[PDB]
Amino acid sequence: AAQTNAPWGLARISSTSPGTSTYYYDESAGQGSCVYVIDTGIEASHPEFEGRAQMVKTYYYSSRDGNGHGTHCAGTVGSRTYGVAKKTQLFGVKVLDDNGSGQYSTIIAGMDFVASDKNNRNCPKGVVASLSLGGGYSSSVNSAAARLQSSGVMVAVAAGNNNADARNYSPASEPSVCTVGASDRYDRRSSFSNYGSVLDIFGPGTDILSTWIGGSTRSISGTSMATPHVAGLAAYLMTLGKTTAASACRYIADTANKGDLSNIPFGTVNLLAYNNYQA
Numbered sequence: 001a002a003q004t005n006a007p008w009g010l011a012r013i014s015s016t017s018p019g020t021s022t023y024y025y026d027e028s029a030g031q032g033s034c035v036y037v038i039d040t041g042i043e044a045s046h047p048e049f050e051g052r053a054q055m056v057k058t059y060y061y062s063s064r065d066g067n068g069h070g071t072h073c074a075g076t077v078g079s080r081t082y083g084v085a086k087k088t089q090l091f092g093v094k095v096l097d098d099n100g101s102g103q104y105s106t107i108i109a110g111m112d113f114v115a116s117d118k119n120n121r122n123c124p125k126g127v128v129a130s131l132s133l134g135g136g137y138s139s140s141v142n143s144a145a146a147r148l149q150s151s152g153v154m155v156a157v158a159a160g161n162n163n164a165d166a167r168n169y170s171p172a173s174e175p176s177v178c179t180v181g182a183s184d185r186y187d188r189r190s191s192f193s194n195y196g197s198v199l200d201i202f203g204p205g206t207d208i209l210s211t212w213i214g215g216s217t218r219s220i221s222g223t224s225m226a227t228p229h230v231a232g233l234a235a236y237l238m239t240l241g242k243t244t245a246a247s248a249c250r251y252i253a254d255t256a257n258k259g260d261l262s263n264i265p266f267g268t269v270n271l272l273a274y275n276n277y278q279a
Contacts, residue, residue: 009204030085084232
């Protein structure tokens with residue numbers, strides 16, 4: 001399938017080169033997979049979600065996304081126009097308040113929630129969790145992310161936006177999950193993206209158009225925007241039967257565009273998420 005005039009990041013994930021604008025993908029589109037977006041919530045009534053999004057948990061007085069960040073990330077995973085996996089099921093877990101903040105104890109509870117809650121959902125092709133969040137190093141946060149991965153969920157986490165080594169941030173620094181850096185439309189490391197040995201992959205993260213609250217859209221930047229490209233890619237590849245939750249990060253790294261990015265520090269992988277779809 002071909003989507004013309006797609007956001008640049010979707011075009012990038014299905015291309016061997018920068019500078020194109022059509023996204024190419026197998027029409028299965030992540031059907032039968034599920035992606036949990038652990039964030040500020042999802043405005044599930046947005047027409048872009050087509051009834052495929054729902055909130056499953058909040059730790060606050062409402063499940064409404066009063067911020068936009070979680071809606072934007074969910075849109076990059078799975079919205080009809082802005083999403084990688086256009087037929088996946090999206091589940092919102094509101095661990096972040098409407099200012100974008102959350103206590104680590106709430107974030108941990110949300111990860112353990114997903115590890116169990118997947119047993120209440122129909123996801124025959126597999127389960128992914130997208131974590132566009134993080135703070136300073138915490139062994140307990142890393143362990144929660146490790147448990148979620150161990151339970152059979154492909155965990156994708158943002159590297160962080162400190163232009164620093166991700167070893168000092170969590171859950172970015174957990175080895176067993178998929179830590180995602182950000183790139184721009186010219187295949188440069190995004191100026192804010194963290195780096196280091198713990199990164200597994202880069203995805204598009206500068207100037208990413210997606211859904212926003214109030215039934216709207218906007219373009220924003222961050223490793224938060226790169227992470228859902230990888231989460232959606234994993235769901236898409238799992239629906240195709242190409243990989244599994246336990247091996248999807250490694251498979252994405254194995255099949256990535258290699259050596260295409262600039263300003264990658266010595267010792268950080270030069271790997272850009274790629275669906276290897278041949279139309």
